[PDB]
Amino acid sequence: PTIAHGDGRRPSKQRTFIVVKNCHKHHISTEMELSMLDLEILHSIPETP
Amino acid sequence: NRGLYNMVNEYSQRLGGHPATSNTEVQFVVIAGTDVFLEQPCSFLQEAF
């Protein structure tokens, strides 16, 4: 909005700001390890206590 | 030199008898500025501090 002024000045008309905001992108990654001996037992079936 | 009830009127009645530029880098006198708001008590009672 704008104030109407009585003193002679250069009057700003109906202004309108169009400001956009672009998103960010955060990509996080840790790195875990697993032994192959802990997978060759995971992908078998046991018949022993 | 005029009346005390006239020289308190002419003080606050937007005289701008001895004004200065507000934000100008080099000080100037204003060209009949109604945009700025200022009052000079050193022009009324005529004493520098």
The experimental method behind these coordinates is cryo-EM
What size, in residues, is chain B? 49
Ramachandran area for residue B9 (φ above 0: left; ψ -120 to 50: alpha; else beta): alpha
Residue with tokens 């934000």: B23
Contacts of B35 in chain A (CB under 8 A): 7, 9
At A47, list the tokens: 């018949």
Q: Are B35 and B25 in contact (CB under 8 A)?
A: no
E strand map for chain B: none
Chains A and B form CB pairs within 8 A to the count of 4
Alpha carbons A7 and B32: distance in angstroms, whole number: 11
At B6, list the tokens: 């006239």
